[PDB]
Each structure stands twice: as structure tokens, then as C-alpha cells.
Amino acid sequence: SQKYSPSIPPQEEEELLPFLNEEFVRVGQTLNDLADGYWGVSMEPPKKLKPGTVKYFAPGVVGPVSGIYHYDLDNQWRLAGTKPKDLPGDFILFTPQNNHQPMGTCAYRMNTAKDEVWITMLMSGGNYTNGATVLDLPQAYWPPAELFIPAYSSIIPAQSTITYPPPSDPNAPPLDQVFDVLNRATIQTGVVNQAMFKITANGRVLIQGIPQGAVFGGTFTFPLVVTP
Amino acid sequence: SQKYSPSIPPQEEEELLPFLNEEFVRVGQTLNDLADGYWGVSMEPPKKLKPGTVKYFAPGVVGPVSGIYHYDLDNQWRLAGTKPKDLPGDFILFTPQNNHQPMGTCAYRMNTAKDEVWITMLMSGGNYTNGATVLDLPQAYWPPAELFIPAYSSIIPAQSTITYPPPSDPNAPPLDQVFDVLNRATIQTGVVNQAMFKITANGRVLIQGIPQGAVFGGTFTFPLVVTP
Amino acid sequence: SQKYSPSIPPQEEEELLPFLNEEFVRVGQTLNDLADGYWGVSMEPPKKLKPGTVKYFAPGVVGPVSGIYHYDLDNQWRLAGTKPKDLPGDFILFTPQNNHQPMGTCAYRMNTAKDEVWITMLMSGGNYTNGATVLDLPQAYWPPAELFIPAYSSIIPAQSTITYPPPSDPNAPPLDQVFDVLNRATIQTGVVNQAMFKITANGRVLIQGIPQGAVFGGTFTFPLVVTP
Numbered sequence: 001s002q003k004y005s006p007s008i009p010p011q012e013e014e015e016l017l018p019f020l021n022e023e024f025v026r027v028g029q030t031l032n033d034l035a036d037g038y039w040g041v042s043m044e045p046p047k048k049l050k051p052g053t054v055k056y057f058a059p060g061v062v063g064p065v066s067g068i069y070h071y072d073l074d075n076q077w078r079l080a081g082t083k084p085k086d087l088p089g090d091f092i093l094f095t096p097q098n099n100h101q102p103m104g105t106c107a108y109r110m111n112t113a114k115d116e117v118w119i120t121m122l123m124s125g126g127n128y129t130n131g132a133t134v135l136d137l138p139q140a141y142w143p144p145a146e147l148f149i150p151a152y153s154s155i156i157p158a159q160s161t162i163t164y165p166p167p168s169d170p171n172a173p174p175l176d177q178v179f180d181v182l183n184r185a186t187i188q189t190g191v192v193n194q195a196m197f198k199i200t201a202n203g204r205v206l207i208q209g210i211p212q213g214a215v216f217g218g219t220f221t222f223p224l225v226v227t228p
Numbered sequence: 229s230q231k232y233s234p235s236i237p238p239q240e241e242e243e244l245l246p247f248l249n250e251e252f253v254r255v256g257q258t259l260n261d262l263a264d265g266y267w268g269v270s271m272e273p274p275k276k277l278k279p280g281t282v283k284y285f286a287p288g289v290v291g292p293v294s295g296i297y298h299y300d301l302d303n304q305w306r307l308a309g310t311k312p313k314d315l316p317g318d319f320i321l322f323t324p325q326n327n328h329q330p331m332g333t334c335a336y337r338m339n340t341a342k343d344e345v346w347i348t349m350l351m352s353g354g355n356y357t358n359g360a361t362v363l364d365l366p367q368a369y370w371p372p373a374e375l376f377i378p379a380y381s382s383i384i385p386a387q388s389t390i391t392y393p394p395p396s397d398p399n400a401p402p403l404d405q406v407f408d409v410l411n412r413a414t415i416q417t418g419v420v421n422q423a424m425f426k427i428t429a430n431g432r433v434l435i436q437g438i439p440q441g442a443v444f445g446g447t448f449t450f451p452l453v454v455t456p
Numbered sequence: 457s458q459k460y461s462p463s464i465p466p467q468e469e470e471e472l473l474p475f476l477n478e479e480f481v482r483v484g485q486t487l488n489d490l491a492d493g494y495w496g497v498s499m500e501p502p503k504k505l506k507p508g509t510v511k512y513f514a515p516g517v518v519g520p521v522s523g524i525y526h527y528d529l530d531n532q533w534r535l536a537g538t539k540p541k542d543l544p545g546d547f548i549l550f551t552p553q554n555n556h557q558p559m560g561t562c563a564y565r566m567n568t569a570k571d572e573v574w575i576t577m578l579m580s581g582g583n584y585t586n587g588a589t590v591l592d593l594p595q596a597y598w599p600p601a602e603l604f605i606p607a608y609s610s611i612i613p614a615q616s617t618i619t620y621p622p623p624s625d626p627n628a629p630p631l632d633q634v635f636d637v638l639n640r641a642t643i644q645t646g647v648v649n650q651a652m653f654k655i656t657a658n659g660r661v662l663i664q665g666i667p668q669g670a671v672f673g674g675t676f677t678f679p680l681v682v683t684p
Contacts, residue, residue, distance in 0.1 A: 053266035081309030081537030192384035309537030
């Protein structure tokens with residue numbers, strides 16, 4: 001933007017008319033060129049710093065990007081548009097339910113910027129009944145819907161049933177019949193229920209498939225409800 | 229910024245020169261002090277509200293942080309730089325492939341702010357062949373590379389082979405030989421393939437290690453490709 | 457904002473006083489109405505584009521939201537407050553420790569916007585001792601505390617011990633005693649240690665419960681420490 005410098009008036013009153021014309025059209029041009037919304041063109045770095053004036057800038061020198069840089073008392077020339085920061089919460093330690101004994105870090109945390117909740121846990125003992133509640137999350141922690149996740153269990157036990165068929169030849173010698181039964185013996189392994197955690201829409205964490213006395217743990221994170 | 233107040237001219241034309249000097253240097257000083265980029269120093273709260281003027285402010289009173297606050301028709305004094313919000317998408321329900329029957333919430337969702345995709349599922353029945361496709365994700369959902377994750381399976385079956393060595397003493401009585409064979413019997417448990425989900429670069433979810441008829445499920449999330 | 461248009465002075469010097477009054481009060485009103493912080497009311501779209509002037513706007517036409525839009529050399533009319541973008545890092549491939557052989561994509565990545573680290577891996581061979589280190593993360597990757605997660609293992613082996621009770625009737629015929637022992641035989645399945653990964657506060661990934669020679673893998677992500 002052009003800077004207006006006032007000019008010395010003429011020496012006698014007779015020549016005051018053209019002088020007023022020129023000076024007034026100059027000031028009018030400056031006022032219009034400023035009032036249209038033209039702060040000027042970004043130029044070389046500014047002069048003495050003082051809080052109250054903040055000249056915008058082009059790429060690079062004052063700031064990496066173009067825009068309207070603005071300094072302050074600290075005089076750090078804040079970027080165009082200031083925001084201190086954003087940060088999630090802290091890991092809230094929760095007392096286990098159903099008399100479960102913590103085997104490590106069993107905590108939960110928000111992430112509002114993520115719209116999620118992250119939970120780590122490792123417990124032993126307590127009620128191992130399927131569907132037993134280990135943690136009741138507050139309403140703000142409620143998932144949008146029912147959810148299931150795999151869970152770690154120190155014990156993954158199986159059941160084995162052994163079947164001994166009757167001897168093929170009942171008239172065979174007892175040693176031969178026993179050997180035939182033994183050679184034709186079979187073993188069937190039962191279904192093993194993998195440890196899993198089920199979280200409902202009301203923020204209740206339930207265990208299923210976890211054997212009694214098994215060190216059960218896991219770390220995970222799940223999205224929250226939509227955040228209007 | 230200083231406010232310029234016009235002054236009354238003198239009473240007679242003879243003394244018009246010094247008056248013009250003073251008033252013009254005053255207006256020139258004001259115009260330069262404004263055109264250098266000095267809106268002024270942030271001060272006590274402003275006066276009557278009207279859309280069109282938006283005075284910036286210091287920390288605290290008008291807004292928690294310094295900067296250029298700007299109100300509007302609603303007159304809420306928006307922070308320096310306005311942005312409505314950002315929000316991820318909704319959980320898209322997908323029809324299971326390979327004739328799999330959903331046992332619960334089987335959905336997937338974007339998170340563009342996260343550059344990730346979050347998928348929950350729980351299914352039974354259908355084709356349990358290793359490498360069978362259960363969901364073909366669209367191209368925007370494609371992971372950067374091949375990926376493998378553990379999967380929950382309601383059935384974790386094992387195989388057991390029983391071995392009966394021949395009697396140590398063939399000349400022993402048949403009861404003794406049978407007892408020796410029985411006491412020297414051995415059992416070997418086979419390898420159990422843990423249920424796992426494999427997602428490729430083309431967004432195809434494949435099952436492996438999941439037994440036939442086993443309720444297989446899991447909830448997880450994975451980062452997307454880099455988003456230029 | 458009103459635009460000031462300079463006016464023609466009167467024809468003779470005698471009538472110069474009221475003219476100065478009117479023109480000076482006009483320019484003073486304009487200067488005050490501009491210096492109070494009133495750029496004007498957002499109006500219909502602006503006129504010839506040139507770098508240096510950037511008129512703000514109302515909702516819709518120039519930009520979807522209200523505010524102070526500002527164009528540039530490219531003349532794209534950047535939104536009120538400019539920011540190029542934010543983006544996470546790349547997946548850093550890491551050489552497995554303990555002579556582990558990679559079976560696929562074994563990489564790790566930062567997410568500073570997420571304050572998290574995402575790791576995928578699939579390895580075979582090497583040292584399968586519990587607590588063996590497979591990757592030592594740098595300090596910036598250190599989790600806030602100790603953490604445990606389930607791990608996928610291609611082998612989930614069990615141990616089975618078979619018990620043969622002595623015959624109920626020692627005076628029974630040897631065939632009957634053998635049949636009674638066989639029918640009263642029992643099988644006990646041992647505890648199976650599920651594969652799991654433990655990550656400590658110093659960024660060391662340890663394996664536990666993974667059988668020797670088992671293809672062990674998994675993909676996961678964990679939050680980092682709080683980022684001040």
C-alpha cells in the first residue's frame with residue numbers, strides 16, 4: 001500500500017484551489033485503496049517490533065507458508081490462526097470386578113481426537129464364569145454397539161475322550177484280543193473355547209471361554225460413538 | 229490506534245495556513261500509523277455488536293487465547309480462524325461371503341482423520357477353507373501391504389495319536405506283557421492351527437486355521453495407505 | 457464500508473469555510489468507521505483479482521463457511537487460516553532379532569497425530585525362549601508402561617498324560633482285569649500357553665508361550681506416551 005505524505009501548502013492564499021484539489025484527490029485515492037480491503041503486497045521483513053501491529057507475509061522468510069502471521073509479547077510470530085494444542089486424557093486405573101487380581105497394568109484411556117477408548121489389562125483369579133463383568137465403563141465410554149474381541153489366556157485346555165472298541169474276534173486268545181482292542185483304540189479331542197472379551201453398548205466388559213485359574217489378559221482399543 | 233477528531237477551522241481566511249499544516253500532519257500520521265499494519269493494541273471489551281466489525285483480543289476475557297476473534301449473526305465471537313468440525317464415517321454393514329452366517333455385528337468403517345479402517349465381525353457356517361474370502365473391501369479400503377491378524381475361534385481342536393510299543397519281554401505272561409505295553413504307552417498331540425485373518429493389498433479378507441463349524445469372530449482396525 | 461469520494465471545491469476563496477467543514481467531517485467519519493475495526497459487511501463477489509488484497513466473505517458463494525478468505529498467486533481463495541496438511545510417517549522395516557526369519561511384512565510406523573505406533577510382523581525360526589527380544593524400539597517409540605497382547609502361533613500344542621488304574625478285582629481273569637483297567641483309563645490334558653507379545657517401557661518386544669518352530673505373527677497398534 002502506498003504511503004501518503006502531506007505536502008507543504010503554497011505561500012499565498014490566491015493559489016489555494018489547485019493545491020486542495022491535488023492533496024484531496026491523493027488522500028482520497030489512498031483511503032479508497034485501503035478501504036477496498038487492500039493491506040498491500042507482502043514485502044521484505046518488517047521494522048521495529050511492537051504488540052498491536054502484525055504484518056502478514058509471503059512464503060519462506062517470516063514463516064514457511066504464506067498468510068497472516070501475527071506476533072505477541074513473546075514475539076514468536078505466530079502462524080496465521082493460533083491454536084495452543086490438543087491432547088488426549090490419562091490412563092485411568094480401574095479396580096477389577098468379580099474379585100479379579102491384577103497381574104499388571106490394567107488401565108483405560110479416552111482419545112477424544114480419536115473418538116476411541118484404549119484399554120489394557122492382565123488379571124488372574126476371581127469369577128471366571130462366562131459373561132462375568134470385570135469393568136463397567138461410564139456412559140461416555142459406551143461403544144456404539146455390541147463388540148467381541150479375542151483374549152489372551154495362559155491356559156488353553158482341551159478335553160480328550162478315549163474309545164476302546166470290543167475285540168474283533170471274541171474267540172481269539174486274550175492276548176490277541178487285547179492287542180486288537182489296543183491297536184483299534186481311538187482318541188477324540190473336544191472343543192476348546194478361545195478366551196474372548198465381549199463389550200456391550202452399556203460399557204460392561206464380560207469374559208467368555210476363559211478357564212478357571214487362567215491368567216487372562218489383553219490390550220486393545222475400540223472406537224466410541226459418533227461425536228456430534 | 230489513535231482516533232482522529234476533525235478540528236474547527238479559524239474564523240478568518242488569513243490564518244488558514246498553519247491550521248492546514250496541523251490538521252493535515254495529524255491526518256497523515258493517523259493514516260500512516262494505520263496503513264503500516266497497526267490495528268492497535270488489544271484493549272477492554274468492545275461496544276455495540278454489529279455484523280461486519282470484528283475486533284481481535286488479548287488472552288482471557290473475550291476468548292481464552294490471544295488472537296483475532298470474529299463474531300457473526302449468532303454473535304458467539306468465533307475463535308481466530310473458524311472450522312465447523314471433522315468427523316469419520318458410519319459403520320457400513322456388509323453381507324458375508326462364502327455363505328457365512330453373521331453371529332452379531334459384522335460392520336466396517338472408515339476413519340479419514342485416522343487414515344484407517346475398523347472392522348468388527350462374528351460369523352458361523354459357510355466355507356471354512358483356508359484362504360476363503362469373507363469380504364472384498366473397495367479400493368479406498370485397501371491396506372498398503374499384506375497383513376495378518378489373530379482371529380477368535382469357538383473351536384480350537386487338537387489331534388492325538390496314541391502309540392503302543394510291543395511288549396518288552398515276549399516270554400512274560402500275557403497279563404504282564406499287556407501291563408508293560410500299557411505302562412509304556414505314549415500320546416502325541418498334533419499341531420493346532422490358530423484361527424487367523426489375512427488381508428491383502430486388494431482388500432480381500434481371508435480365513436485360515438478356522439475349523440469347520442467353528443464360531444469365528446474378531447474386532448480390529450488397520451491403517452490405510454498414505455493419503456496425499 | 458462507505459467509500460469517500462473527494463468533492464470539487466467552491467469557485468471563490470470567500471466560501472472556503474463551510475466546504476472544509478463538510479469535507480473534513482466526511483473524511484473523519486470514514487476514518488473513524490474504518491479505524492474502529494470495521495472492514496465492512498460481506499457482500500457480493502469481489503472484482504479484479506490481484507495478490508495483496510483478500511476480501512473476507514459470508515457463507516456459501518466464495519466459500520462454504522463464513523470468515524476471512526484469502527487468495528494467492530494460484531488464486532484458489534484459501535479458507536480463513538491456511539494449513540498445508542498433516543501426515544504420519546512411513547512403515548520402517550526392521551531386521552528381526554534372535555535370528556528370526558521374516559515370513560512376511562514385518563514393519564513398524566509412527567503416527568504422531570495419533571500418538572501411536574503400529575507394528576505388523578510374521579516370523580519363524582530363531583530363539584523361541586520366553587522373554588527373547590525380537591525388536592528393540594527407539595526411545596521415541598517407548599510405550600508409557602508395560603503391555604501385553606495376544607499373539608498368533610501356527611502351532612498350539614497340548615500335552616496329554618494317560619493314567620491306567622490298577623485292576624478293580626485282582627482275582628478276576630486276566631482278560632477281565634485288562635478290560636476293567638482299559639475301561640477305567642483316564643486322560644488329562646495339560647495347560648497350553650497361548651502365544652503372546654510383551655512390550656516394556658523401554659521398547660523391547662518379547663515373545664512368550666510361542667512353541668519352538670511355530671510360525672508366530674500378529675498385527676497391532678499401541679498408543680505412545682503423552683506428547684507435551
